[PDB]
Design a protein around this ligand. Structure first.
Ligand SMILES: */C=C/C(=O)N1CCC(c2ccc(-c3nc(Nc4cc(C)n[nH]4)cc(N4CCN(C)CC4)n3)cc2)CC1
Ligand code: NA
Length: 287
């Protein structure tokens, strides 16, 4: 069925599925206890998150879940990327086992910390969040990975408020895009997507940078919805004409100019992740 990969395999007898965390796209995610998944402590149970198919799964859903698991393998480890811990790939349903982030996705996290007009985000927190995600994305870029679905909803927050890029279902090696074919990039959410991904059917690191701009806007509006009141059907005409989202209130001119830089029409005129990391480092240090 699936070719065995001993390096990553995890005994099913050692995994105890628990309460569900939620559902979307090609899968479901449940909380679980894994005994000895940290090999240095073979009798310790760790709380983990298990991604598996839903009952109404399609062939494509399975393909996507396999693709995500395989991608997590190719990427290697980093503090701001959700860690693959192992997989049950043999003699039963596909379980992809990830490190557990207790606080769920960043969009809901930020929305829950909006003031009345479960605590409050400081400016420094927002910049920190942004910086962590830039570092994650820089590392990703260096591993030849394009994520293609960057967005607040695809970031998980740990118990200690560490930001972890997640949901690698759409992620590709940079060389594994079907350039110029009309079906290419057809499953990317339009409001986070670089124009060239649609108009040219390509996807480079600079396309991810565009998405990161949108994510920055989400962060600074505390989980606001991009292009409020503009239907998806009308976006791409407005973008060709040079329309861009206005500056969020609790955001500096400098950080807004960085967003606008990520949204440069010309992909090559956008900053790299490395430049974003350096700039955010400087700003975070100063605050
Ligand atoms: C469509 C893209 C895609 O691949 N999916 C859609 C969204 C689905 C989803 C993912 C994650 C959660 C989720 N996860 C966690 N923790 C977690 C998950 C992982 C892999 N590691 N840690 C926690 C939560 N919550 C929900 C509300 N609780 C109050 C807090 C914890 N939710 C849900 C859905 C995946 C597939
Ligand atoms: Na089914």
């Amino acid at each position: 069925e699936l070719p065995e990969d001993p390096k990553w395999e995890f005994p099913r007898d050692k995994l105890t599925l628990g309460k569900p965390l939620g559902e979307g796209c090609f899968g479901q995610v449940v909380m679980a206890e894994a005994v000895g998944i940290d090999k240095d402590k073979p009798k310790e149970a760790v709380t983990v998150a298990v991604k598996m198919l839903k009952d109404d799964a399609t062939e494509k859903d399975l393909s996507d879940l396999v693709s995500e698991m395989e991608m997590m393998k190719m990427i290697g480890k980093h503090k701001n990327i959700i860690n693959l811990l192992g997989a049950c790939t043999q003699d039963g349903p596909l379980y992809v086992i990830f490190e557990y982030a207790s606080k769920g996705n960043l969009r809901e996290y930020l929305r829950a910390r909006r003031p009345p007009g479960e605590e409050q985000m400081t400016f420094k927190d927002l910049v920190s969040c942004t910086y962590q995600l830039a570092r994650g994305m820089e590392y990703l870029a260096s591993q030849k990975c394009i994520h293609r679905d960057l967005a607040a909803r695809n970031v998980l927050v740990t118990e200690n408020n560490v930001m972890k890029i997640a949901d690698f279902g759409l992620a590709r090696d940079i060389n594994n895009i079907d350039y110029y074919k009309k079906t290419t990039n057809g499953r990317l959410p339009v409001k986070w997507m670089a124009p060239e991904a649609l108009f040219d059917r390509v996807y480079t690191h600079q396309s991810d940078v565009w998405s990161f701009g949108v994510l920055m806007w989400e962060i600074f509006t505390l989980g606001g919805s991009p292009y409020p009141g503009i239907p998806v059907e009308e976006l791409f005409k407005l973008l060709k004409e040079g329309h861009r989202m206005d500056k969020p209130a609790n955001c500096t001119n400098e950080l807004y100019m960085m967003m606008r830089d990520c949204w440069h029409a010309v992909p090559s005129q956008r900053p790299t992740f490395k430049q974003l990391v350096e700039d955010l480092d400087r700003i975070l240090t100063l605050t």
